[model samples]
Target: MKDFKEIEIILDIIKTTREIIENDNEKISYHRNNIRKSIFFLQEELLEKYSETVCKYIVFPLLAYVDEKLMLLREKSASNISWSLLQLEYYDRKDGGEYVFEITDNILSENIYPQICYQTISLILHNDFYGKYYDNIYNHSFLAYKKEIDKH
Candidate 1:
């Protein structure tokens, strides 16, 4: 709550980014959806309601550079979300369960998407939804993404 406005400003950049990306790219689509979901989730956490204003805003004709500036802000935050999956994994197997629980607890204390994101993580892990249509896409993409990150 300390930097509430600043946090909102940062999340605003994330929302603005949704416009620049080509949604036709499947990976980019996933990234955009995740970006929207995370920002909406965090905004809901801070503001207690989703601001549709944040979802879209008109770039007035004379203010053509406004989107450009917002895009610049996007560059500033790209590094924040990296390595997040690393914190969400269970590598050791032996003590990994406890580690993930502790990890989720830590994630919940932060103001952002982590609370909702980790809920998604645990819910998918505990549920038997592999046979479900969209659930399969969500779960497999998560696995592939995790493994891809883990390999690096």
Candidate 2:
């Protein structure tokens, strides 16, 4: 397994990615593209190099951190009441795993903007149920995605 410092590097990637997206002062496209490339590299590392234990304990949690920041952005942009309604919609639609998978696939496979995909993953991972719903969503989706890749 990798050391904590190595794991922190991955976490920093997630954090920096969020900060770039959150900061209006930065060029959103530049940071967004960088994040997409970084995420793709992370995916490759996980698929080709890391053990399941390392990925499950280290990589997935870093993904959660990324998602949490995204949820924060959503809240900051919307008013309190509007955010509450948004939360409700989040929970209501969360169980639609097929849609989630499609979005995940599109994000990983297509030329879709990284920030949007990051936002989608972030929203799904930190939905209205205070991370509970999204945690499961992420775990299930990640596992399934990994399994599909392993098969090929």
The TM-score leader among the candidates is: 2
lDDT of each: 0.34, 0.44
Model 1 per-residue lDDT tens digits across residues 72-148: 33446543222112112212122332333333344444544323334333332333212122235455544543343
Clashes of 2: 0
| C-alpha RMSD for every candidate | 16.4, 12.2
Model 2, residue 64: C-alpha shift (Å): 2.8
Model 1 quality (TM-score): 0.24
The parts of candidate 2 lying over 4 Å away from their true place are: 1-8, 51-57, 78-130, 133-152
Kindly report the root-mean-square deviation of model 1 from the true structure over all alpha carbons: 16.4
TM-score of 2: 0.39
Alpha-carbon shift of residue 80 in model 2 (angstroms): 15
